[PDB]
Amino acid sequence: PISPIETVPVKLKPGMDGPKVKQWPLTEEKIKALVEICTEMEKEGKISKIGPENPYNTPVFAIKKKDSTKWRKLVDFRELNKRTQDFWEVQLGIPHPAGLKKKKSVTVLDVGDAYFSVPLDEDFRKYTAFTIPSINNETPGIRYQYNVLPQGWKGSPAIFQSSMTKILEPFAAQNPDIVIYQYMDDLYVGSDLEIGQHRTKIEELRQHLLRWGLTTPDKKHQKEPPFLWMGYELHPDKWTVQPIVLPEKDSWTVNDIQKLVGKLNWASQIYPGIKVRQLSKLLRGTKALTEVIPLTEEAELELAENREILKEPVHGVYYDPSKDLIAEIQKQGQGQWTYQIYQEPFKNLKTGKYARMRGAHTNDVKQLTEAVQKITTESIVIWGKTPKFKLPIQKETWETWWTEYWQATWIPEWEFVNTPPLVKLWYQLEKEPIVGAETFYVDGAANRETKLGKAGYVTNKGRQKVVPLTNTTNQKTELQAIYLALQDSGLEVNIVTDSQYALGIIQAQPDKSESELVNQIIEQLIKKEKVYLAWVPAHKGIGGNEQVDKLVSA
Amino acid sequence: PISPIETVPVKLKPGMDGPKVKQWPLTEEKIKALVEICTEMEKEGKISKIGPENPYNTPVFAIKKKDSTKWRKLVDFRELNKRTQDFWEVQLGIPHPAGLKKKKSVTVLDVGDAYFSVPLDEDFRKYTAFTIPSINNETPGIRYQYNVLPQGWKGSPAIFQSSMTKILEPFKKQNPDIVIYQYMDDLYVGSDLEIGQHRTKIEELRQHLLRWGLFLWMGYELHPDKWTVQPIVLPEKDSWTVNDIQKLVGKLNWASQIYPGIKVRQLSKLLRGTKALTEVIPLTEEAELELAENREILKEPVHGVYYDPSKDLIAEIQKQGQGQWTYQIYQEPFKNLKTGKYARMRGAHTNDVKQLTEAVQKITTESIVIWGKTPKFKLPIQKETWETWWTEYWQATWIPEWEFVNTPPLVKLWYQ
Ligand SMILES: COC(=O)CCCC=C(c1cc(C#N)c(OC)c(C(=O)OC)c1)c1cc(C#N)c(OC)c(C(=O)OC)c1
Numbered sequence: 021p022i023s024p025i026e027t028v029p030v031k032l033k034p035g036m037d038g039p040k041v042k043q044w045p046l047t048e049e050k051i052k053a054l055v056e057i058c059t060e061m062e063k064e065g066k067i068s069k070i071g072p073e074n075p076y077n078t079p080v081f082a083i084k085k086k087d088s089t090k091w092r093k094l095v096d097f098r099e100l101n102k103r104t105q106d107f108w109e110v111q112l113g114i115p116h117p118a119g120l121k122k123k124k125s126v127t128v129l130d131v132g133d134a135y136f137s138v139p140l141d142e143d144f145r146k147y148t149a150f151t152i153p154s155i156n157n158e159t160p161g162i163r164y165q166y167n168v169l170p171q172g173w174k175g176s177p178a179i180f181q182s183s184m185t186k187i188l189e190p191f192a193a194q195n196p197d198i199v200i201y202q203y204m205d206d207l208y209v210g211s212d213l214e215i216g217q218h219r220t221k222i223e224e225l226r227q228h229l230l231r232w233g234l235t236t237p238d239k240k241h242q243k244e245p246p247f248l249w250m251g252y253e254l255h256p257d258k259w260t261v262q263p264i265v266l267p268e269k270d271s272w273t274v275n276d277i278q279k280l281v282g283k284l285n286w287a288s289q290i291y292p293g294i295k296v297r298q299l300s301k302l303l304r305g306t307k308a309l310t311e312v313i314p315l316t317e318e319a320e321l322e323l324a325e326n327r328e329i330l331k332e333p334v335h336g337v338y339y340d341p342s343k344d345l346i347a348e349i350q351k352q353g354q355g356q357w358t359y360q361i362y363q364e365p366f367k368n369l370k371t372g373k374y375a376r377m378r379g380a381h382t383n384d385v386k387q388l389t390e391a392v393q394k395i396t397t398e399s400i401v402i403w404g405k406t407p408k409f410k411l412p413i414q415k416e417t418w419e420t421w422w423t424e425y426w427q428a429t430w431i432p433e434w435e436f437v438n439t440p441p442l443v444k445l446w447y448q449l450e451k452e453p454i455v456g457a458e459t460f461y462v463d464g465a466a467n468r469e470t471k472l473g474k475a476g477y478v479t480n481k482g483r484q485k486v487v488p489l490t491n492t493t494n495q496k497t498e499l500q501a502i503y504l505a506l507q508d509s510g511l512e513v514n515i516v517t518d519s520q521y522a523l524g525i526i527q528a529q530p531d532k533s534e535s536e537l538v539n540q541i542i543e544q545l546i547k548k549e550k551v552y553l554a555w556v557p558a559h560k561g562i563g564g565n566e567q568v569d570k571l572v573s574a
Numbered sequence: 575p576i577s578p579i580e581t582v583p584v585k586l587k588p589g590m591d592g593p594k595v596k597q598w599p600l601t602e603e604k605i606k607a608l609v610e611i612c613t614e615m616e617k618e619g620k621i622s623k624i625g626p627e628n629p630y631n632t633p634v635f636a637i638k639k640k641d642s643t644k645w646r647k648l649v650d651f652r653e654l655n656k657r658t659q660d661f662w663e664v665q666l667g668i669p670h671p672a673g674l675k676k677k678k679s680v681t682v683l684d685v686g687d688a689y690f691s692v693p694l695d696e697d698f699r700k701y702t703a704f705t706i707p708s709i710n711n712e713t714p715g716i717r718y719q720y721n722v723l724p725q726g727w728k729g730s731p732a733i734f735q736s737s738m739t740k741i742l743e744p745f746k747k748q749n750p751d752i753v754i755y756q757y758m759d760d761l762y763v764g765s766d767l768e769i770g771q772h773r774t775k776i777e778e779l780r781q782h783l784l785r786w787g788l789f790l791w792m793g794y795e796l797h798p799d800k801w802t803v804q805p806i807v808l809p810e811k812d813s814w815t816v817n818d819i820q821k822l823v824g825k826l827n828w829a830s831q832i833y834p835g836i837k838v839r840q841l842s843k844l845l846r847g848t849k850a851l852t853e854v855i856p857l858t859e860e861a862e863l864e865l866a867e868n869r870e871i872l873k874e875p876v877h878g879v880y881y882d883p884s885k886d887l888i889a890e891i892q893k894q895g896q897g898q899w900t901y902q903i904y905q906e907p908f909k910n911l912k913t914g915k916y917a918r919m920r921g922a923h924t925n926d927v928k929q930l931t932e933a934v935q936k937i938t939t940e941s942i943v944i945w946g947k948t949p950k951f952k953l954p955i956q957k958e959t960w961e962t963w964w965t966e967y968w969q970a971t972w973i974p975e976w977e978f979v980n981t982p983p984l985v986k987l988w989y990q
Contacts, residue, residue: 028625029665104631108703119710178626180987185714201712231578386956391961397599404602404709426982428893428926428955430963450617453817461848480850514851516820520984554851555984556820557827565850 053091107178123210132205381530409434450552460505461564464497475500506544576787607645659731677764686759887949
């Protein structure tokens with residue numbers, strides 16, 4: 021006296037129609053197989069013979085899994101899928117081991133024996149019709165349609181999980197002391213109860229699933245540490261990635277390292293320190309899918325620090341809601357950062373890396389801020405809360421930075437951690453002109469066609485300079501001019517420019533750039549004791565900006 | 575006992591599909607709060623669980639209005655709103671009350687609950703689907719759909735405009751000079767009284783609305799002021815340094831894109847010559863005249879600037895430091911319709927983002943009052959920082975649009 025699984029109303033995309041594909045000519049041997057199969061399935065209730073009305077048809081095949089017995093039918097709804105509506109695929113991404121809480125006992129029920137005991141929408145069945153061709157086609161092929169969720173049809177996964185959940189809902193509700201997890205053919209149930217009171221409440225489950233007929237094997241077991249799940253290695257109280265075997269190859273191609281990039285990042289979520297900068301920049305742009313490209317001398321000393329990080333298999337533990345969550349970051353250079361999230365010393369729930377965003381200029385503080393936001397979002401996803409941070413930056417440094425940064429910025433609760441190299445401010449522009457310091461009026465200008473230009477300055481003390489330049493632009497001459505003033509002035513200096521382009525670069529406060537020119541300037545600024553950069557509008561007869569502007573043109 | 579025995583026909587914009595916005599990660603507490611909230615809305619029948627046959631989705635989260643500490647469910651209907659038939663009530667909207675922005679005072683009311691007493695057109699319900707996410711994709715998300723008019727939807731205030739008009743007559747007939755405006759889930763009440771009699775008079779409108787079948791009780795005080803567009807002012811000094819004249823010339827040059835008559839020749843002249851930045855320059859006869867003439871041009875308003883209901887409003891914000899922010903609202907560059915200076919508040923000069931988020935809400939509120947619609951924000955913050963921590967400080971039932979400026983504007987101080 022079992023109760024039915026409520027059916028899910030389905031429909032085909034608006035304006036479209038059901039599939040009308042031709043059936044493939046099968047061999048006499050294959051046909052008998054299908055007939056044997058379709059004969060039992062009809063008995064079980066799975067399918068049902070239809071008349072000639074149904075104008076719909078979906079290709080059907082049979083295949084022998086090599087070195088294993090019998091045949092298994094296989095329908096191709098490739099076309100019924102392209103005509104089926106959209107379903108809320110709630111299968112978007114699975115949990116992260118680091119998010120799992122350890123349980124004294126964890127069982128596994130196999131409910132694949134339900135994917136078929138779940139009915140299909142009545143008015144939709146007519147769209148799953150398929151034909152079994154007859155031997156020698158001297159007879160009408162046998163017609164069929166589904167009465168359940170077909171294997172391979174667009175919405176079978178979505179509809180199955182939904183039904184399973186609904187049935188499970190009440191059980192979970194009245195069993196807070198246990199934890200059920202449903203995903204595919206398996207149902208993971210765990211609890212911190214006596215192994216006795218556990219297999220107990222399990223029976224109840226297997227039994228609760230009975231009130232809907234759904235049968236769950238009278239299983240004993242087929243598994244034990246290490247639980248190989250979704251590329252991981254799970255254990256009763258620890259996890260890590262599948263054995264990450266670094267290819268001991270001599271000739272690395274695009275795929276060779278590219279399958280080493282997406283396979284190294286995987287490894288990075290637990291092995292502290294992994295890098296992929298000098299390796300991903302070797303195939304960022306490259307013709308073909310594969311190709312034996314040379315590995316930079318830099319992509320050899322980091323990959324070597326991989327067989328020492330990927331040498332000793334490290335393990336990530338499980339999350340404990342009672343302990344605080346901590347996130348630690350380190351600077352690694354070239355715009356690389358790594359972090360470990362843990363609750364207790366050295367017991368990393370997980371680890372990871374962060375690469376700088378591709379841009380012209382940048383500074384370590386902005387980079388840190390970015391890594392922090394990333395870790396925050398990843399943390400909310402995995403644990404539902406923001407971790408406390410332990411960063412390599414002084415409180416004073418951070419205060420100075422955010423109170424003077426033109427943009428709004430913020431980092432959640434954090435503490436300074438004295439683990440070098442510390443992130444810091446390399447220079448700091450004055451807010452007012454410096455009394456007693458020499459005032460350098462600079463300018464640059466180039467010729468659009470000849471690419472010839474000049475850069476220079478004139479100061480209040482009479483100091484002057486103008487240098488001719490070839491293969492330059494207006495922007496470069498504007499930067500070179502500032503550079504000259506910096507090279508030729510004392511420790512304290514006032515620079516006047518009309519270059520909005522220059523100000524924009526400097527006001528972004530970069531400590532590193534793609535441009536060697538900007539970097540030289542950064543280098544000079546680091547050396548100075550005080551620099552006040554003032555801007556004046558061009559061609560206004562400001563003079564000193566007008567005098568140098570003349571010397572720099574023609 | 576209020577619930578229209580019928581439902582008003584509603585559809586999406588011609589040739590536009592329902593929303594399918596991703597739900598973003600939520601903290602464990604916000605999740606728990608949404609679970610409690612929805613479990614009740616379900617019994618009260620405002621919502622119902624849905625099967626996987628529904629592909630539509632709209633983001634959802636939790637906040638807290640001013641005073642009550644109690645969690646409030648907020649649905650980001652931005653996508654659905656722009657895809658929902660622009661409600662062209664056969665009555666032709668509500669002509670923006672040009673008189674609300676002139677009233678010495680304005681009180682803001684959260685009449686949202688009212689909406690939940692009116693049923694939603696059965697054919698539109700699937701479009702209001704939202705998900706209460708689970709931590710670490712452990713369990714599947716709880717899916718729901720609305721049965722009643724949902725707070726935050728553009729259609730709620732319209733589908734309800736009928737019931738509201740009559741729930742107000744016994745007040746609007748009485749108080750002839752008072753102005754009442756509605757936007758989203760808010761009711762705006764302006765007057766020319768004084769705090770004393772303007773404050774208690776609202777209570778009258780509170781119970782009145784409370785007797786027509788109706789976070790009911792919350793009210794933000796407002797009094798919008800002068801200089802829709804603030805004047806540009808030049809310093810007045812007895813001794814100018816070369817640096818002072820350089821900045822002044824910079825500001826005037828900039829101002830001339832707004833006021834063509836501005837001249838900076840007689841001032842640049844003092845600059846001709848490479849002098850020390852901190853040296854004092856005496857103003858010449860000619861120079862002070864120009865500084866005088868310019869000063870006069872800046873007093874008058876800008877040339878024939880007008881609002882164009884077809885075009886959207888742009889809002890720019892600048893971080894000035896020490897908890898001070900500036901902003902300008904416009905449609906065409908150099909043609910401001912409003913400029914302001916939102917000073918120190920909660921940011922408690924420790925959180926730049928909380929401040930910016932309050933500024934934005936304040937700018938949006940001012941915007942609702944003047945033109946009856948929110949403006950498009952240009953935020954001085956990295957997208958990644960803002961997207962991570964804008965919802966932690968948000969408190970309005972509505973939400974505006976925004977973009978990000980990544981290059982430091984040269985004109986920061988000129989707006990100070
Ligand atoms: C809450 O979200 C999840 O659980 C996601 C599910 C993750 C997958 C497994 C899992 C591992 C654990 C561990 N350790 C668990 O305990 C902390 C749990 C648990 O508690 O959930 C009920 C689940 C898993 C995968 C297997 C595969 N393949 C497998 O067969 C080898 C076995 C197994 O147990 O065989 C004996 C277990």
